[PDB]
Structure 1
Amino acid sequence: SLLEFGKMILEETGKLAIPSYSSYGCYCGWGGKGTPKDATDRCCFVHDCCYGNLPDCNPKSDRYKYKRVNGAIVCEKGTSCENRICECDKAAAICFRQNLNTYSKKYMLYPDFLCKGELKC
């Protein structure tokens, strides 16, 4: 769920999910259109695609468990939707940590009309 995703992000990056990553670029948050603006936005695109592979799961509301094994994220065994949702989120949080150095505040509150183009998962 958003509750676990949020905590994972803050743990990884030191930033709070809302509003560092809920209105960034074309894909972090609401958006699902155009070309991702930078590497952080591409993490959100791949995260959305990840969720798109689970049409019968409910990643916003279904809760899973995960633990830290010295830093490393380990998804705990739950239902199969929970395990797969956790893997999507874990990947995104790592993707965000890996691109913290190019995160730009110019992409916060990014306007819709500037999200132009096509990109298939």
Structure 2
Amino acid sequence: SLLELGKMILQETGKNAITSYGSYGCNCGWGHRGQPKDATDRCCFVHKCCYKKLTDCNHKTDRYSYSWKNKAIICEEKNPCLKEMCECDKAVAICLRENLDTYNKKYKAYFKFKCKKPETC
């Protein structure tokens, strides 16, 4: 669920998921589609590709079990669909952290940039 995702993002990036990534670029956030503007945005594109293919559970509301163990994320979820959700979320948290070096606050304001047509997953 968004609760686990938000915690993972805090754990890995040190950032507030909602304020830093709730509306960033063409892919980070509800309703956001379009070609990625930078590496952070690409993380969010990959993430949506990852979870949108799952049919048997809900990314937003279904909670799952994971541990923050030895300063990393371990998906410890028995439900196969929720384990896949967890892996998608783990991947985006890591990706966002690895790309902090190019995070750009300009992409938090939708009017400041244009979005090209989305690429395929």
User: Paired residue for 1:11?
Assistant: 11
* Structure 1 unaligned blocks of 5 or more: none
Q: Percent identity?
A: 64
- Tell whether the 8 Å contact from 2:106 to 2:112 is kept in structure 1 after alignment: no
Secondary structure of 1:101's aligned partner: helix
* Structure 2 unaligned blocks of 5 or more: none
71-80 or 17-26: bigger deviation: 71-80
User: Paired residue for 1:22?
Assistant: 22
* Cα distance change of structure 1 residues 113 and 69 upon mapping to structure 2, 3 Å threshold: closer
TM-score normalised by structure 2 residue count: 0.93
Secondary structure of 1:64's aligned partner: coil
TM-score normalised by structure 1 residue count: 0.93
* Cα distance change of structure 1 residues 113 and 99 upon mapping to structure 2, 3 Å threshold: closer
Consecutive aligned runs of 4 or more in structure 1 exceeding 6 Å deviation: none
Cα shift at 1:117? 2.0
Give the Cα–Cα distance (whole angstroms) in 1 for the partners of residues 64 and 83 of structure 2. 7
Cα shift at 1:40? 0.2
Cα shift at 1:111? 3.3
| Matched pairs, number | 121
Give the Cα–Cα distance (whole angstroms) in 2 for the partners of residues 80 and 111 of structure 1. 40
Secondary structure of 2:95's aligned partner: helix
- Tell whether the 8 Å contact from 2:107 to 2:113 is kept in structure 1 after alignment: no
Counterpart mapping for 1:32-71 below 5 A:
32-71=32-71
Cα shift at 1:113? 7.5
Give the Cα–Cα distance (whole angstroms) in 2 for the partners of residues 109 and 57 of structure 1. 31
Give the Cα–Cα distance (whole angstroms) in 2 for the partners of residues 17 and 91 of structure 1. 14
Secondary structure of 1:118's aligned partner: coil
Give the Cα–Cα distance (whole angstroms) in 2 for the partners of residues 44 and 31 of structure 1. 12
User: Paired residue for 2:107?
Assistant: 107
